[PDB]
Amino acid sequence: QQMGIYAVMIEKMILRDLCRFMFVYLVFLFGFSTAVVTLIEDGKYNSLYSTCLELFKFTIGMGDLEFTENYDFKAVFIILLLAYVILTYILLLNMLIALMGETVNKIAQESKNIWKLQRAITILDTEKSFLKCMRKAXXXXXXXXXXX
Amino acid sequence: LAIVKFLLQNSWQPADISARDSVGNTVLHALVEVADNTVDNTKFVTSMYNEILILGAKLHPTLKLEEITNRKGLTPLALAASSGKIGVLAYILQREIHEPECRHLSRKFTEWAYGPVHSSLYDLSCIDTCEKNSVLEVIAYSSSETPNRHDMLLVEPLNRLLQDKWDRFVKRIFYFNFFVYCLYMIIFTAAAYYRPVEGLPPYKLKNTVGDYFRVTGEILSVSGGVYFFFRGIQYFLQRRPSVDSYSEILFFVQSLFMLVSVVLYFSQRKEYVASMVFSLAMGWTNMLYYTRGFQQMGIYAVMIEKMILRDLCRFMFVYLVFLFGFSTAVVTLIEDGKYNSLYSTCLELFKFTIGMGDLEFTENYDFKAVFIILLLAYVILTYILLLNMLIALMGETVNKIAQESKNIWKLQRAITILDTEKSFLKCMRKAXXXXXXXXXXX
């Protein structure tokens, strides 16, 4: 129950929140990385993939800031990197946490329903998927509230 | 009321029910002006309004009272909407009257009702009022001075009307615009990505497939650039501008950057590109604008805008202040080694915030314990205290916004739709509302 309800949040969190942050992250990272590749003539940081990977590290927590020397008009390259970090590493990562905080507040009662549903589906299937082997097939609940 | 009646009905001098005050306002205009969006306010204005109309139609049936414009060209409705008097605008939208002479006055007529079921019909003046103003048009591009502008779309006649268009024609129109824009981006990037390395551009065109392809892209991208600049100018001029409605400004700015780059290129300066690099970056981010009309994504984009200026802006000031102070304290500290330069020390100080902070980066400082104390304090107040604070504050902007940020998204689709039809050549387009209904209540 504690772990299963937790797993529901991970699934809920992943597609909607993670999916949303991923799109913008790909859009920002792609744009800025392209802007950088244009910027650098040589040194293997020219390759779009290579620049893009270097740009990713900023998000991971491994960002190098000024990784490559072989660029012209140096102040612009730094401006490009500072803007990418401010909008994208800080503004996004901190935003993602707050939005995650939202999915968590709304879910939990809903995420208990989902967990309850999942056990039911697992149980229902095994008996059906259990060969419909001999199994129970009266309900009553012991009760005591007064009301008296 | 009684005196309103006695004024209009008396034997001695009946009031002219349509007279205009110095500002052009009639009694219906004045009532709109006297509304203050409180529940009991709406209630009294709303029915005194009703009362005036009932008296107009009783006493002087020929008079189309609603239609009378104040000095500024505003019908009562259009004033209501210009000044965020929403309860009253909503009442006008929802007006329904049934009595002899009722039909001329009423806003909504209901026609099909089945034991379950109900239908509502809306006039509707606001959508089709090309000649002077539209309720949607007034709401869609409001001053942003007005106390209540975001709220208004919600009312049933306008909000449903807007949703209805998008399904029928407009969304299909928007996607083609988005797709067309996307290609412009791949091209701007592609030329820039593949631009020739060799100096003193522009180098003469090669007799190669690659030279032919890249050159088309460069021309296409600049041409793409002009479109925004032309569209942009119209908004400044046509939009009667005017830091509000930023997305248009960003589109204008990115294009301007692209234009400046073009001026530099023909000048033949090597740096034309730095202009180009800025122009390319501005464009991809502006792709974030195209998210709207996707409900989950568009609402999300509103939070990014809301988050950015107020929260990001606030954290930025203190961050610049702290980082500047401490960095200066450090430069003084170090005699030599290139960590003396204020910019260099400041950049080294920044890394602490990124997550790349070096702690003790430089040896060549005196009184070493002090330098470490300086760096530890900067980290404690500034990396941890700030970054963790920024997250909590962001958590706050998020909680307050979301309902508000849904209103903003709704507003943005409306503005996009309203403009395309107006900005769509005012091409032939719809210009009856009713809502299928079924609640009992029975």
Q: How far is A85 from chain B (nearest CA, A)?
A: 8
Please report which residue ranges of B60-134 form alpha helices under DSSP H.
76-82, 86-93, 102-105, 125-128
CA–CA gap between residue B350 and residue A86 (Å, rounded): 11
Residue with tokens 């909590």: B392
Q: What is the DSSP string of B199-241?
A: SSSPPPPPSSHHHHHHHHHHHHHHHHHHHHHHHHHHHHHHT--
The order of strands in the sheet holding B108-109 is B108-109, B118-122, B433-437
Residue B76 exposure: Cα atoms within 13 Å on the Cβ side = 29
Q: Any idea what the Cα angle at residue B77 is, between residues B75 and B81, rounded to 5°? A: 115
Question: Is the Cβ pair A24, B195 closer than 8 Å?
Answer: no
φ and ψ at A25, to 5 degrees?
-60, -45
Nearest CB among A28, A63, A64 relative to B285 is that of A28
Furthest C-alpha separation in chain B: 101
CA dihedral of A47, A53, A55, A57, whole degrees rounded to 10: -160
Give the N- to C-terminal CA distance of chain A in Å, as an integer. Answer: 35
Q: Is A61 annotated as a binding residue?
A: yes
Please report residues of A whose CB lies closer than 8 A to that of B347.
Answer: 65-66, 78
CA–CA gap between residue B168 and residue B372 (Å, rounded): 66
In 3D space, the residue among B138, B40, B26, B149 whose CA is nearest the CA of residue B86 turns out to be: B149
Residues placed in the known binding site of B for resiniferatoxin: 246-247, 285, 292
Task: Calculate helix-pair angle for A74-84, B272-286, nearest 10 degrees.
Answer: 10
| Residue of chain A whose Cα is closest to the Cα of B273 | A39
List the structure tokens of B67: 């239609």
CA–CA gap between residue B331 and residue B338 (Å, rounded): 10
Cβ-based burial of B239 (10 A; exposed 0-12, middle 13-18, buried ≥19): middle
CA–CA gap between residue B128 and residue A133 (Å, rounded): 68
Would you call the peptide bond into B202 cis, given omega within 30 degrees of 0 as the criterion? yes
φ and ψ at B109, to 5 degrees?
-120, 135
CA–CA gap between residue B408 and residue B401 (Å, rounded): 10
CA–CA gap between residue A21 and residue A100 (Å, rounded): 10
Please report which residue ranges of B268-291 form alpha helices under DSSP H.
272-286
Please report residues of A whose CB lies closer than 8 A to that of B387.
Answer: 90, 94
Cβ atoms < 10 Å from Cβ of B27: 22
Residues with Cβ within 8 Å of B88's Cβ and at least 6 positions away in sequence, in order, are: B31, B32, B35, B42, B45, B46, B49, B80
CA–CA gap between residue B96 and residue B424 (Å, rounded): 33
Furthest C-alpha separation in chain A: 88
CA distances (Å), B202 to each of B196, B199, B261, B285, B377, in order? 9, 8, 13, 28, 52
Would you call the peptide bond into B441 cis, given omega within 30 degrees of 0 as the criterion? yes
CA–CA gap between residue B259 and residue B38 (Å, rounded): 51
Sign of the alpha-carbon dihedral angle for B394, B244, A21, A114: positive
CA–CA gap between residue A59 and residue B383 (Å, rounded): 16
CA–CA gap between residue A97 and residue B201 (Å, rounded): 46
Resolution in A: 3.3
CA dihedral of B37, B42, B44, B50, whole degrees rounded to 10: 140
Element containing residue B108 per DSSP (H, E): strand B108-109
Residues with Cβ within 8 Å of A107's Cβ and at least 6 positions away in sequence, in order, are: A8, A9, A12
Question: Is the Cβ pair A72, B277 closer than 8 Å?
Answer: no
Residue B326 exposure: Cα atoms within 13 Å on the Cβ side = 27
Strand B433-437 relative to strand B108-109, pairing: unpaired
Asked if A27 and B284 touch (Cβ cutoff 8 Å), the reply is: yes
CA–CA gap between residue A75 and residue B88 (Å, rounded): 56
The residues with which B209 forms a beta bridge, in sequence order, are: none
Give the A:B interface size as CB pairs under 8 Å: 117
